[PDB]
Design a protein around this ligand. Sequence first.
Ligand SMILES: CCCCCCCC/C=C/CCCCCCCC(=O)OC[C@H](O)CO
Ligand SMILES: CCCCCCCC/C=C\CCCCCCCC(=O)OC[C@H](O)CO
Ligand SMILES: CCCCCCCC/C=C\CCCCCCCC(=O)OC[C@H](O)CO
Ligand SMILES: CCCCCCCC/C=C\CCCCCCCC(=O)OC[C@H](O)CO
Ligand SMILES: *C(=O)CCCCCCCCCCCCCCC
Ligand SMILES: *C(=O)CCCCCCCCCCCCCCC
Lengths: 181, 175, 178, 180, 145, 145, 145, 145
Amino acid sequence: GVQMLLTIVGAFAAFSLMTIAVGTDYWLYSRGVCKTKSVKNEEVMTHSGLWRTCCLEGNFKGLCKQIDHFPTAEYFLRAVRASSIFPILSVILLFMGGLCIAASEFYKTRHNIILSAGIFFVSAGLSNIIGIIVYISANAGSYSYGWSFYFGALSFIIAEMVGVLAVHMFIDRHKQLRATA
Amino acid sequence: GVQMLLTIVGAFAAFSLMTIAVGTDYWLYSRGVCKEVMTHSGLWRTCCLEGNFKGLCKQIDHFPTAEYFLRAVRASSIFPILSVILLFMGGLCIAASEFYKTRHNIILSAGIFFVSAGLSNIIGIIVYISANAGNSYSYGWSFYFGALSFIIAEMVGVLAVHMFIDRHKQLRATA
Amino acid sequence: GVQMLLTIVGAFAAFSLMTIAVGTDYWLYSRGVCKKNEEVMTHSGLWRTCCLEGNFKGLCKQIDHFPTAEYFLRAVRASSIFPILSVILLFMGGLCIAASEFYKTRHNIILSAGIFFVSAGLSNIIGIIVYISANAGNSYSYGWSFYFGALSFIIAEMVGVLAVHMFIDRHKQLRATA
Amino acid sequence: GVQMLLTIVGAFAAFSLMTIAVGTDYWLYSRGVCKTSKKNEEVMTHSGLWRTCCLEGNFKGLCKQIDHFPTAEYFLRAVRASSIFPILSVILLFMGGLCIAASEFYKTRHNIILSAGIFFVSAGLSNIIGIIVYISANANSYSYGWSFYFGALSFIIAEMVGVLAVHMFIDRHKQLRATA
Amino acid sequence: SKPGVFSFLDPLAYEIWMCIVFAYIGVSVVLFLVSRFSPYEWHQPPNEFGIFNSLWFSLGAFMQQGCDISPRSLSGRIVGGVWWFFTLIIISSYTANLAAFLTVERMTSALSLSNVAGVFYILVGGLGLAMLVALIEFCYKSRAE
Amino acid sequence: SKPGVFSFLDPLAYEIWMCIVFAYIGVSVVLFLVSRFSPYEWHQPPNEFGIFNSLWFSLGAFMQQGCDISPRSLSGRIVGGVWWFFTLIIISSYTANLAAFLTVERMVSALSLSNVAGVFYILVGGLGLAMLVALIEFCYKSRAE
Amino acid sequence: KPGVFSFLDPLAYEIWMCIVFAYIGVSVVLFLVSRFSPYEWHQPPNEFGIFNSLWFSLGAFMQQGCDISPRSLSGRIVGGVWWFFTLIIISSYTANLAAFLTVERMKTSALSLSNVAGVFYILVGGLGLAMLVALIEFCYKSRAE
Amino acid sequence: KPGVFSFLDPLAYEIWMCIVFAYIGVSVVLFLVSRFSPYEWHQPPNEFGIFNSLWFSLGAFMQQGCDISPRSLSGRIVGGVWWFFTLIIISSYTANLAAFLTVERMVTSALSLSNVAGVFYILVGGLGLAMLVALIEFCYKSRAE
Ligand SMILES: CCCCCCCC/C=C/CCCCCCCC(=O)OC[C@H](O)CO
Ligand SMILES: CCCCCCCC/C=C\CCCCCCCC(=O)OC[C@H](O)CO
Ligand SMILES: CCCCCCCC/C=C\CCCCCCCC(=O)OC[C@H](O)CO
Ligand SMILES: CCCCCCCC/C=C\CCCCCCCC(=O)OC[C@H](O)CO
Ligand SMILES: *C(=O)CCCCCCCCCCCCCCC
Ligand SMILES: *C(=O)CCCCCCCCCCCCCCC
């Protein structure tokens, strides 16, 4: 009862946090530009996210551009980093975890819909680690990560905690069945 | 019993040693200024060693954010002083343990105080050495009294815990 | 038995691969002479080094050897004693397998098979190590013959554990009847 | 029975080996002088614990003494000169053999056998120190000689006797437990 | 030339340290999951890999220390094996890069207390926290009595 | 520049990384052989050194991390004692040669996540494989009942 | 000539002194947090008295010793921080030593017995002390019969 | 090309000969203390017999896993000094090996198999000896039957 309540709240939190990370732009306070060619540049502080990059300060404060991820084993990294499959697949897996948790509130007989939720959450956390590494690794080849990156990092922790909690609930259901039989 | 006597003598030794350390002037024999020759510095004074005067216990210029916090601690010497306080509080507990025999939970308090006193002294040594490392220097008797007090206090902190354990064993045996 | 069939198929596979390796000349793709000349691509082996993409395409010449401790290693690599020894031990392993189907009361034959296959695997390791170490004195890549030898080792070792289990099962059955 | 036989033979072998080592002069095949003008000539020599005897040249066979003294460094030289530890192992192995001999006569005191065990084990430990103090003080090529290997070999033959003696002690007390 | 309190973390970058924490929280959870999720293994805990022991085992592995509990299934061992390989590389990289940081000074001396003094602070801090966590429980149990 | 994904395997040549796998598969099999080939030892297997626990032991011995069960016979111990010597040199050669790279290329006139980013994919990839192995068994065991 | 005790040059005298002080500290705390609780003795709750705590701490610093490991949150915080402290310090000694060797502290030579000489005196001296302790205990027991 | 057994270059011949002598000595002192006293035998007070003592002293030196751990005072002293000895020596090897590599590389450079080819011959040789020893035991008992 109370354990399922924590799970529901934690599930939403991680989903919400991760959707706010993949959508915002405050990932990496870099030092670049925001505009393109014209008939010199303006290297000013630029909070750059996954898809867009607005110049924090400078004469063009608030102009977001489209990060150009393509300026053997390096092409593959770019493609993955450019399509943000991993940070987007974590959001797809956390959402499917919520459906599984919600489904298990209307069909109590099926105990395997709770284990599914746990695996989804745990796998979502694992897909958000590859996202972090891919991000950092590709971004490499002075900076300061922002709150958007930390929501992605914080999402993992919340998701992993929901993951163990869901596994515990699965075991608890089956323990009741092994005591009443 | 025999254990109580050691716990009392040991506590006094620890407290006394550490108080002497904090109060003396022979922590680190260096070579510097005393108003350049050898100067047996301490925790509060840097007293001249030989020369035209031989005796001039000058004060330390501790203040000529990772270098302000370290300095503050070193200067205020909170941790060395804090160990003395905790050793003193541990002694009261032992003394209170006699009057209020029934209350066995006072003995454990002494153990925690003594154990925590040792941990404060450890930070003291590190803080002292780290900041003072800011020249052939050698540590004097005062520094080793501080270090020896730590050892004596840790020994009196395990003995206290055993005494607390023994109290409860008698409670669980008779009842 | 199904287990017996695996061992037999695995034994033959190991033997085949290893022999095909020792006899073929595709162990190390390098770039050296085959007959002052030129360094065209070649596909060296154990007994011969035959240039591949060259004017004299398909000309093959006995690997030039010997060009006391160093002497010992030269002789060991030149004679390929270990690669050849592995083939022999793998062969004897097959003979042992094909002897526990007739004298099926001994059961020490199967243990011999196991030891042969396991010991033929260890000989294979030393053969690989000797080969890689003599190629010391840029474009050295290994071919399929080298990997057939390496693949044989794994196949041999797997037969070895399988045979030991086969031996163990025989004795466990004999223990139950007693 | 036969276990005691090995111990005796092994104890004698250990003792004999070590004594030869100390007394001989073939420990370190170096290249030095053997004669106490303003001239010199270094020829191959076989050093020992006491004397540096030449084995080549016109001075073939002339055995010079060694001035080990031509506070850490002083202590090393002082110990290396007197050979305290190598000689101490000789003394310990000799005493350890007396105990085994004393056993046959007094067969009602089990601590005679365990005494031999401690002497033999402790004799090995002195031998280790002797080797170390000889290799550290000694430090153009060198190659240790058969005399140095009789020392090293003595250690092994004395540690094996040591465990064997301790088993004898253990075993005897085990038989007493049975009788009880 | 100037030493810092937490200057023992210099070899491995900030990101490396951050991702190690994430990989520790991940391996532990995954190790727990596999071991205990199957309802065809309990007869009681088939093994000792709860949510608490898993964290301890992962931490132990990384610190190159003892093995109280050891995985015995096939899925546990795979998790253990990769974690041991990760640890190995990472712990060899720290040492290897620390030897570089202590040679070829760019802008040899015996390391002083100021170089490894942040660790001492963490050590004493941990001891203090442990004693607190032990007395908090104690009190809690005491009132229940 | 751009350190390759799998740039943590540089301290040792390709043939060493290959021959280590071969030596591992060989030590495990030989440990299995000597421990459980004696009909005159089972009284119920004598020691827990089957074929699946003899690979875990070898893997643990190489990775350093690992301390569960050790051989107890003369033959088994010899196997484990040469394997232990092998591991020591190999794990001290990796670290030592890795330091040389990180020193030599520095002297030329802090490791980044990229340098050790092919060991994180392996770790995470291994966790994925482990969760697939466990789930497969679960499914196959839940179908039969 | 390299001093007898030249295996203590990497770390400063203070570091060595402070390690000893931290070892004593950790041991006392690990004993306290593990045995002070009156509500765990059912027979002590574990084998972590003042003697085994010293052994555990000592073994954990040396990177050896697989006797026992804590089983309590309070006793596992101490373990974890001590293991972290150890890791850093042992890596520091193995890295700073390689700096000393690589950069002559006035081709390379091979370490001679003279360099690591005080580690064989300690060992032999320790073996002597061990036997002495054993014999006096046995002698005392033999005078009590 | 380097010598087959070139992995024994970061230490001198007199340190390997002394390590073996120290190993033997430690294993005979450990056995002695543990089992000499007749006031502890019940079955034996502990598992530290002559055969096992060699195994525990070889295991300790190789920084490998556990099977037993001394529980006496005298025995623990031997363990402690042996662990300290091992620490220094193993650290010195790795540290001095890196020196050799770095200085040689300054006068990629991934370690070729020729550099470390004696640890493989030893390994396979030990596996060969191990099997032979096992079969000798087997043959002996088999004939007896
Ligand atoms: C049940 C299992 C519980 C296990 C519990 C084990 C805890 C081990 C903790 C170690 C922390 C060590 C790392 C500390 C990092 C400090 C970072 C820091 O100080 O950062 C400074 C900054 O970079 C510039 O000012
Ligand atoms: C049942 C117990 C068995 C459990 C076993 C667990 C195995 C995990 C161990 C290590 C990971 C090694 C993965 C190596 C992946 C290959 C790396 C690679 O491809 O490197 C590039 C190239 O090969 C170079 O030139
Ligand atoms: C319970 C039984 C205990 C376990 C027993 C087995 C343990 C074997 C361990 C190490 C082998 C080391 C072998 C080292 C061989 C060195 C080779 C050598 O002597 O080389 C000389 C050199 O070539 C001159 O130039
Ligand atoms: C039950 C636990 C307690 C029993 C087990 C204890 C084992 C001791 C281990 C290691 C210390 C060995 C080294 C001690 C001495 C090193 C310092 C030293 O002597 O240094 C001299 C030097 O000359 C100064 O300048
Ligand atoms: C819970 O039961 C509380 C009452 C029993 C005493 C336990 C705590 C005693 C020690 C208090 C803290 C000592 C000083 C700590 C700061 C140095
Ligand atoms: C066998 O019968 C399966 C029972 C458990 C089903 C759990 C849910 C499906 C598995 C997880 C789905 C994949 C998530 C991660 C994808 C990258």
